[PDB]
């Protein structure tokens, strides 16, 4: 996260780390949506242009964390994957449309003060809250400064970072880029004029864009960190997978097994 701040403890108990186990590295963020299911971006697992194709045994999920690099000994839980599910129409050839994947955990995590699932939006929550100008919140352990152009100024955080960003109008989104934007995406970020900055950045992909409902005070995940051009570049915006538009597939796959 670029221009964010350190998260408080327990501020985002659904945040998950996607961790590969050899070499040990952070791949991406993710989110806990029940005791056995994790949501992330499909491009974290599967991206043929770069010969990226992770399977279950390649990966660990780490839940309950705050420190990026510490093994957080009586706090985090580490889990193994039993099944990865990518959207059958994820478009990695062109524009990362339907950039979504579900992961089944080998066995359920227990909740705690540090581990708690986020809600998924329904129609009226989506309708009400997904409006330009409304702010949501993005969290992650990715770079603090632009890294598809690998950067200094500090580099990597020690703790989970947070930033709050406005949703932007679709015309301005589509006018900022040459990429074809779909209805399964939205964009977010401040405009060049507004004074404030901030963005997700490398290593943040796959993580939650969340909003808090003013009607029932619950946190809902509205987006997944999906893509962008650079990090925090003026006149560019982050793009997020639209979680409500792909909710039938999510329900479908967690109903089919589903046991």
């Amino acid at each position: 996260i670029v221009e964010g701040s350190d998260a408080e403890i327990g501020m985002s108990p659904w945040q998950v780390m996607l961790f590969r186990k050899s070499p040990q590295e952070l791949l991406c963020g993710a989110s806990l949506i029940s005791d056995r299911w994790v949501l992330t971006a499909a491009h974290c697992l599967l991206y043929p242009p770069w010969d990226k194709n992770f399977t279950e045994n390649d990966l660990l999920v780490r839940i309950g964390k705050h420190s990026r690099t510490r093994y957080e000994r009586n706090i985090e839980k580490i889990s193994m994957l039993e099944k990865i599910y990518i959207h059958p129409r994820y478009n990695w050839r062109e524009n990362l449309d339907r950039d979504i994947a579900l992961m089944k955990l080998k066995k359920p995590v227990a909740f705690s003060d540090y581990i708690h699932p986020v809600c998924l939006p329904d129609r009226e929550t989506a309708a009400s809250l997904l409006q330009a100008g409304y702010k949501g919140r993005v969290t992650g352990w990715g770079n603090l400064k632009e890294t598809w152009t690998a950067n200094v100024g500090k580099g990597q955080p020690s703790v989970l970072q947070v930033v709050n960003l406005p949703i932007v109008e679709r015309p301005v989104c589509k006018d900022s880029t040459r990429i074809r934007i779909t209805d399964n995406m939205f964009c977010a970020g401040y405009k060049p004029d507004e004074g404030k900055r901030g963005d997700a950045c490398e290593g943040d992909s796959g993580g939650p864009f969340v909003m808090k409902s003013p009607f029932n005070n619950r946190w809902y995940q509205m987006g997944i960190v999906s893509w962008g051009e650079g990090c925090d570049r003026d006149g560019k915006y982050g793009f997020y997978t639209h979680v409500f538009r792909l909710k039938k597939w999510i329900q479908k796959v967690i109903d089919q097994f589903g046991e």
């Binding site: 186990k21 040990q24 590295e25 690099t69 093994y71």
Partner: peptide, 10 residues
């Protein structure tokens, strides 16, 4: 860069 995790996780 990461601290060592327990070998029951690999």
């Amino acid at each position: 860069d990461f601290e060592e995790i327990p070998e029951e996780y690999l």
